[PDB]
Amino acid sequence: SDIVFYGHKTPKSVEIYLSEKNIIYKIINDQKISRGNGHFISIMVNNYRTHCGVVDINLNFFNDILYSVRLKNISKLENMEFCATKQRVYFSDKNKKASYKIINYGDYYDVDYYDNNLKNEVFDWIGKWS
Ligand SMILES: [Cl-]
């Protein structure tokens, strides 16, 4: 997979990274939704300093592998292609750059970094099992 969070791809290693940096985070998952056999974990942090500014972040995992890093609430006055490309290396596997999509909400932007293959697998899985 081509996406990491500062070198980490698994929920627990990401949780340890954030905890040791004294960053508060919230964890949500599909364990109750699925009644026991969950496949999704998302970790949420607020006010995280990136090259797109101070942003909120979701770290999205499928089968304990990161597939998506979403930066939220970026100023509409930010140079989006520049800040997205500047932050990219920190969310990219050493082998391969993560993909990214700029999402315009009108009053602000999100940037979603993602592994295209993994994200397609997630979409395929949702359509199959729901
Ligand atoms: Cl939590």
Swiss-Prot record:
Coiled coil: none annotated. It comes from the Bacteria. This is Uncharacterized protein YdcD. It comes from Escherichia coli (strain K12). The chain holds residues 31 to 160 of 160 of the full protein.
